[PDB]
Amino acid sequence: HHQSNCNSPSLTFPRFIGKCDSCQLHTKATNLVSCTSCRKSSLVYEECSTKGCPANWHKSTCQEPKFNRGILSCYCENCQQHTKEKQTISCKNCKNSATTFSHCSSPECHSRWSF
């Protein structure tokens, strides 16, 4: 609590591949939001690329993942700024969606990000 907030949010959206806990293959993609200024991060969404894995959010009948990504802009309930984003992940072919976690980029909120 001796710490101080970051007053220059500068956001990037890293993606790392790792081991999926379900199928145990090296196919789990962890997508984040990160501030390069303070180097804190918040999980946005996870997905496994293994066909048929419960951690893969596509229908069983999906022929081809057609990835598209959406952005919604909201007012934040913690800092009252217009700095909140709800991202959407869905497939144009199969119509399923991945679970997503929102984030707020304000100095007040993004400084409390953890990962």
Ligand SMILES: [Zn+2]
């Ligand atoms: Zn998997």
Ligand SMILES: [Zn+2]
């Ligand atoms: Zn920062």
Ligand SMILES: [Zn+2]
């Ligand atoms: Zn906020």
Ligand SMILES: [Zn+2]
């Ligand atoms: Zn699909």
